[model samples]
Target: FTIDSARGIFPNTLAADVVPATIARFSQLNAEDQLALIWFAYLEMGKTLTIAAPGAASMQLAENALKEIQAMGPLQQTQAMCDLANRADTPLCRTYASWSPNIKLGFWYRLGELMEQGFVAPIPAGYQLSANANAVLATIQGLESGQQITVLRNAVVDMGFTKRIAEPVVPPQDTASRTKVSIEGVTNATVLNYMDNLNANDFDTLIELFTSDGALQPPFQRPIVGKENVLRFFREECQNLKLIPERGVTEPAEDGFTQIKVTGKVQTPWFGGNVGMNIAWRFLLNPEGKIFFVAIDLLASPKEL
Candidate 1:
């Protein structure tokens, strides 16, 4: 069954308790307890992977192995699985020991899949399993998918697993304080209106918005400085560029500059299609609120936007 389905049967509290306890003292448990522990691990892992149900014979064999595994102690079970995970070349590894119990169990369950596929070999010298656990593991190795699932599910039922309602948790209210500052000279709306002029392909108006030394900067290119250079760049480069402004916001920044953030899409021959991005235009205004010096920055990838 899926983790969501299993969650419906098992209480959230039970999962919370069993996960830590199983990791701490897996081998110390009785046959039923060990089976329950492993079942819980598989269920937890099922959240991230597909886990099939087991058949009758595999189920019976799993119970037999559970007894032997319980006798092997928690560290042995952990180390053996770690070795197997590494050997199988899966993402599961020794680092799983530090993961949350649910995540660790997921990897543990994956290790079982490797075992069934005959991808896992016995740990060499110094690291080992009990004779019975080893024999059970060997028998299950290279077994069919149905056989593997049977053993997994049988252990789950023998452990006395059942579904229970999940407890409800109330989320905290968002009560963080915020500060709003008034714009002193230029309104953000006015700056956006200026940008609308650019979208309309009104190069004359766009050039009028800039001072004599204004600059235009496109991504990964040299900045076109001076009103003359900016004009030339627009004439040569921006002639085919089409901009569709979605939204705009303006705020005051350091050095008396106004920050205008515009979210929009721009189409160009180089882009092949519209490139979505957030464009940040830093405007330095004259005393009369005319843009004098401006810098443009793109805040997102053309592809992602």
Candidate 2:
């Protein structure tokens, strides 16, 4: 559950809306919300280390991760925290994912302290916890000391980007491939076309891929309705960027559309692309094999605000 929740989306819902504030549901929150919850949990726990520290290993093992995060400039520190919270495929997060559970615990505790000094990104001013997160905290507080520590420790250890491990071949012909991993993930042919056309900046194919009344929704931005409008949007904004799709999923569908969500990035933009920001594209297609709606959502929960 830890690994799944860590890698999976935040339930397509909100932490505040869950009926029961259990850790299981808590694990499903967006990265910013989860990080905020974790930070809130530790600060609220206060001198809990006196009880939890002895049984688990000390914070010394987390020294390197702490130092690396600490060494970053202000903006990089913010990016680092977001990366860790979202479990990004970056060097820092990979290093974190490789640590022992207890070391992970130590690392967060120290990071929590750094927040006090404003060395890392601080929770936004006037930032308030939602009812769902508060409920999760309430549940954690309700548990006994040992149980509380276990929850926190587990939560800490589970928060990180996935590790990249190569699969070795079997013994046949200098070993065949270990697993059919690349064969995995949901990739619709239309989406493949979308990527190629978008990368090529071929406006004609891009415009033709969708139906006449189809719409495009960018993050926190206006919706480009109608094929002509979508063409305008693409030509004006997405023209020079290359779209790269990563992991994709089929979340069933809503309305009459087949939902194939492709999570990836656009290269060559400034902040949202060049420096590194991942986004997801929802390819909701209709029965006629035409796109009805396309939504571009950012990977980081912090982007929500």
Candidate 3:
């Protein structure tokens, strides 16, 4: 079949419902869920679909769009991905609209990889795909590699703001409103212990929680290295700082140092005033269950701080 005709299999033509049957269900999924199924389908295909775009295709022409998404903070990046996936009428969606179909395919491909790696927001840990979505995904896997790529490419090509619409669209700034202190997940035991001691400002117990080579990185500052320096920074620079963690997310510690990222508010001296600023704390703990590195990042922008 010709590529365009094959692409039409997606979005369900008249013959699609009775024959392919998968289209009926796939057509009903929200854009992000459809994208998730497509991502899983791409992943399920392994390297076979790798040949679809030829030599893994040098990132095509979506570089600026890719760069734009990468430039966003974690929250914004997640929102921007949702915009692209869900066809939101925002500036980022307009940027996505300008890409070639092949480039769009690559964009989602990179997004899938990023989601898998936890660079962008990943699939919710406890989320389950609806049965029809899973069925449609399974059906896509049954297609030939050529049919698979065609469907995948065309699937994303029609999403988002496919053309420029100048009549006063949605803005991107509002994503910041839902931004900080809302990342909810269970905190790690060692990390909770650390946060507790940190909140208590008990440097004596806190310092012992670290390995000798442990380091602390507060935003826009130099890394405080070794136990002695870490202690010094704590007593001097971190005196007023108290962690009020609302939630934390941990990917179980690996053989090497694995990380737990938590978001909350920090009562710290900022802009020469004591204020509670929303912040994210990232901890890298050794298998020995001691902190090797921990970084404090402000989630809210400076004006908000």
Candidate 4:
């Protein structure tokens, strides 16, 4: 059967009812049940259905899986598509292993869209998915990059997949409430200077912006206290990573702190190339205007930090 006709069969059968009903049922479950189904979804479709996020690695994985699936026989392919749509996890999940990869991918994409629209419950905290889960959930509602990372981190730990999750090059930031403060010492120029230091990869100069007892907190690691640890961390990070600042600004916060937000691309061995990232540097300056406490947060995805 042709791909178009094969796809048409879905809308005409119990498959049609099965898919949405499953999603609707999934949405009604508590966090624990939702997370269990998410895990099952990953086991069944993770290989072919990449999470709905933008990235070369995720897309490549999805594309490669699609190629293999597309090579199967028609009946085999159709069955596989059905299993995916049904979120099957039994030996039946492999019954249609020979299905059309493209069709299977479409089902996965559509299912992800449904899950993201809040039709499915939020992925519980401390729950993780496979690479497929990462791809799909990343695109869904309730699990932004940070939450995704957190889920994956905790999952890997629980599964013994890894000793630790690699800290996100960008960390999650708190922005639920923003209070405006006086703009006395904090100016647009000061923020721009910090961006310059970042682009220059001048760890020394960048650290100098902080006071003698300043601190630096990265997404994954423990807080680096004291100027010595801060300088050491920066020295190591700068040696391995490079930042290309695109835009930046400085502002005053509710507390006696200045916020510097920088949007940029970062290149490192972990990501294997430059990926879009945003950095928020909040500076608590000394009376002399030198920064005493600096909190650095990095976000890899396009969300506010």
Candidate 5:
């Protein structure tokens, strides 16, 4: 069953909304009826993405509709095409369609994939729009496509969708309004919580605790930042770490700055050996009370006493 949930409007809808406004602002349409018709056209395009109807042929039909509209003008056509692409079911197609216009490496890449899957015929040069077409593309191009997609995914999952069999929507509290401490305090508390959770083998809350913007530092064993990246890293790498921390503690830094110093032992199957290490961490906060950044230095080696 399809139901519409009023979360923040999706990007496709945003793009769709702008089209009529842009058209009315730039071009002359004599009658309100004509303008209404145009508006409905844009709205329908947006709806198609939100609905994501089954069958490859449905998508092909939508694509054909967009191509016919493309002849009107490059900008309008590109916008319509993108609206279609963003609604695409496959990750690859949606990712490519969301790309910044000039760097749309993903579009061509996914076009090949689409062809392989027999979704659409392969294009010799993919697609390009002109100066007018360039306007919306230029505006949206500043966004990181992958990040944009991630943001959209978060929004959709959190907010629910129109005409979707949505799970219960529970709004998450803003983590920005948490405890305030220096770089050291912030780092120590966060890392300690992470470590404590890790040692306790509490995987779900561990993923839940990170800030939305957090990301892992990389190299498999590197630190994690941002909620999504942290989750991805833990799922991808840390799952096998089997980390166990024997002992740990934190000390405040000088001048009221918070410092976290940890001395701990860890046993992980992936590292091939149990090790002990002394770690130091610091954190800084923005006015919003979010941990804005962190700095870490290893004071002692894993093999050290």
Candidate 6:
């Protein structure tokens, strides 16, 4: 697999917190099903495939198969099944079902095979249903928790399916080995400086910070790209507005870019009111380390009282 430091199997930022429900869901499947789910989940985690199957393939057939499999699963048993598959590490349960550990897609055929036979395997007893469904839907959390793999073996041990496999552990790194640093360079101070210049409505420095060919996407509108275009956009929209940015975090991208999340407020002349907006910004830098591409998305908004 390509170990691009910037392009990880999963973004390190999102992987820190593992979702319990996803772990539980993974624990529910049988050894074969676990392998299948892991493969499919891997692909989903990596954002490799948009749809479950190829578009040229029969969507109806796939849908029908899924529907039938889901139909056999009682509303009551669903949670239990998912739990066992996630937590117990059955030897029959291999994690890297596909060739590339990064790109997961090989497990789909295996899942189809399990669905054909019906998911009749016994899962762990007293598996509790998860009330927090949406929270568990996160991709990276499910991937990194390592809980599902742990549970898979546990279940196998319980069922006498297989014994645990122990591999040699590597030594911890010292200063030399840890020389390469992961920098969250775009800190709150940096963003604040940019904002200070912006509230003064200083177009020159603001444009310099963003890519010359970058873009700006404000709330409820089309994206405006290019330094000139962005300047024009600020001139027209930010003429009398106050922009406040807060609570920001930065993630380094594989393409030598930085992705920032900033939440704060924007005071516009239109309503003469303060509107809080959370912005997700992607900054693509040039060879000179200046931004060349800026893609911004509005994450959330609410009227501050």
Candidate order by lDDT, decreasing, is 2, 3, 4, 1, 6, 5
TM-score of candidate 1 to 2 decimals? 0.33
- Per-residue accuracy of model 6 over 237-287 as CA lDDT, tens digit each: 354445555455666655555455554444443223423333444444444
Q: How far off is model 3, as Cα RMSD?
A: 21.9
**Per-residue C-alpha lDDT of model 4 across residues 1-305, encoded as one tens digit per residue:** 22122122112111112222233444344434444445554544445333443234323434544444456554554444444444456443442233223223333444345445644333444665445434444343343333332333222222100011111233212234322222323445445555556545556666777667666655433457777877666553443344555555555543354445454444443333423334444444444556555544545345442
Candidate models: Cα lDDT each: 0.41, 0.60, 0.59, 0.43, 0.34, 0.40
Which prediction has the highest lDDT against the true structure? 2
Query: Candidate 5 at residue 5, lDDT?
Result: 15
Q: TM-scores for all candidates?
A: 0.33, 0.42, 0.42, 0.37, 0.28, 0.34
Model 3 worst lDDT run, 10 consecutive residues: 10-19
When 1 and 6 are scored with TM-score, the better candidate is: 6
Model 2 lDDT, residue 184, Cα:
28
Q: Candidate 3 lDDT, tens digit per residue, 1-305?
A: 22122122112111112112454467578756775786677667765423233113327456567778777788778677667767779976777676544456567767777778877776666666787788777777765443344356556765777532111111222323322223367545677677766655567777998878777876534467789988766654454345667776676544565667776665532111223455667777788888877776544232222
RMSD of 2: 16.7
TM-score-wise, the better of 3 and 4 is: 3
Clashes of each: 8, 3, 0, 10, 14, 26
Worst 10 residues of 6 by lDDT: 97-106
